[PDB]
Amino acid sequence: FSKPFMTLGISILYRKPNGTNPGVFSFLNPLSPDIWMYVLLACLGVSC
Amino acid sequence: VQNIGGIFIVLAAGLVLSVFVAVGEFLYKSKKNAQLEKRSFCSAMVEE
Ligand SMILES: *[C@@H]1O[C@H](CO)[C@@H](O[C@@H]2O[C@H](CO)[C@@H](O[C@@H]3O[C@H](CO[C@H]4O[C@H](CO)[C@@H](O)[C@H](O)[C@@H]4O[C@@H]4O[C@H](CO)[C@@H](O[C@@H]5O[C@H](CO)[C@H](O)[C@H](O)[C@H]5O)[C@H](O)[C@H]4NC(C)=O)[C@@H](O)[C@H](O[C@H]4O[C@H](CO)[C@@H](O)[C@H](O)[C@@H]4O)[C@@H]3O)[C@H](O)[C@H]2NC(C)=O)[C@H](O)[C@H]1NC(C)=O
Ligand SMILES: CCCCCCCC/C=C/CCCCCCCC(=O)O[C@@H](COC(=O)CCCCCCCCCCCCCCC)COP(=O)([O-])OCC[N+](C)(C)C
Ligand SMILES: CCCCCCCC/C=C/CCCCCCCC(=O)O[C@@H](COC(=O)CCCCCCCCCCCCCCC)COP(=O)([O-])OCC[N+](C)(C)C
Ligand SMILES: CC(C)CCC[C@@H](C)[C@H]1CC[C@H]2[C@@H]3CC=C4C[C@@H](O)CC[C@]4(C)[C@H]3CC[C@]12C
Numbered sequence: 012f013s014k015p016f017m018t019l020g021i022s023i024l025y026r027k028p029n030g031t032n033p034g035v036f037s038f039l040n041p042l043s044p045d046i047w048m049y050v051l052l053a054c055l056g057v058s059c
Numbered sequence: 060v061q062n063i064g065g066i067f068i069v070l071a072a073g074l075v076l077s078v079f080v081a082v083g084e085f086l087y088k089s090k091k092n093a094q095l096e097k098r099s100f101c102s103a104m105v106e107e
């Protein structure tokens with residue numbers, strides 16, 4: 012061989028995992044969809 | 060409902076407590092008016 016004209020390295024080719032975006036109704040996520048109903052039935056209940 | 064949960068219990072606890080004290084104030088104005096006309100049914104039925 013001669014001297015190198017390029018330096019290598021063995022590594023792993025693999026797909027990037029798809030970063031599904033936090034879509035525009037993202038702020039409803041910190042409570043469960045039945046709890047948002049339970050709050051809504053509370054403010055419809057306690058007001059009655 | 061597993062996470063927070065218990066604030067709905069004390070919401071159901073205080074409002075049942077509040078109906079109890081609502082009757083006791085209703086029976087208290089039937090008590091200060093008990094020296095006026097009759098014992099219960101005068102101040103009850105007019106305020107019912
Ligand atoms: C990037 O983000 C995206 C998000 O969209 C992702 O991209 C794609 O994700 C896909 C999902 O993994 C991936 O797979 C292709 O999609 C479909 C999947 O449909 C069914 O296809 C196969 C059946 O042919 C199944 O193997 C699949 O699992 C799938 O659903 C059901 O799964 C069951 C489990 O195997 C299967 O078998 C049943 O299993 C039970 C228990 O084991 C019983 O035995 C039962 O009897 C079995 O039937 C179910 O049958 C199956 N249901 C149905 C209705 O099929 C698929 O079309 C595709 O290829 C299939 O079909 C083609 C048709 O010709 C054929 O070419 C294939 O051989 C294969 O049969 C794939 O499976 C996509 O590849 C991927 N796309 C890309 C570009 O990546 C990525 O996940 C994200 N990327 C990263 C890195 O995260
Ligand atoms: C503290 C106040 C409480 C109020 C009580 C009432 C609460 C009653 C609520 C009850 C449930 C409402 C939210 C649903 C549950 C969210 C989970 C879900 O899966 O939905 C998802 C579908 O997107 C939707 O469909 C969301 C619903 C749309 C209407 C939102 C009205 C806002 C509430 C009106 C309040 C204003 C008036 C208030 C009074 C003046 C949302 O998630 P995503 O982002 O779409 O994820 C996918 C994105 N992606 C596809 C790219 C991957
Ligand atoms: C006294 C006691 C009460 C009496 C009983 C009465 C009976 C009541 C019993 C009710 C039982 C519960 C049934 C509903 C269950 C829904 C949960 C769910 O998973 O679905 C979805 C809810 O996401 C929504 O789409 C919500 C609807 C829009 C939100 C706005 C509503 C309030 C607006 C403001 C309020 C103003 C407040 C004013 C205050 C003065 C979430 O999943 P998804 O992925 O989004 O699904 C998409 C569906 N889609 C495609 C059709 C869109
Ligand atoms: C005042 C009223 C209108 C509020 C809304 C209705 C209340 C009474 C109901 C609606 C759904 C109910 C909850 C449904 C599920 C559970 C899980 C269980 O393991 C304990 C009770 C608990 C936590 C319930 C408590 C009472 C509850 C919150």
Ligand SMILES: CC(C)CCC[C@@H](C)[C@H]1CC[C@H]2[C@@H]3CC=C4C[C@@H](O)CC[C@]4(C)[C@H]3CC[C@]12C
Binds near residue numbers: 080083084087
């Ligand atoms: C705990 C229940 C069962 C019995 C006690 C009820 C209490 C909360 C009620 C009964 C009598 C009420 C009082 C009766 C009259 C007056 C005068 C008015 O100008 C201001 C309110 C005031 C001062 C009321 C405040 C509330 C009161 C003290």
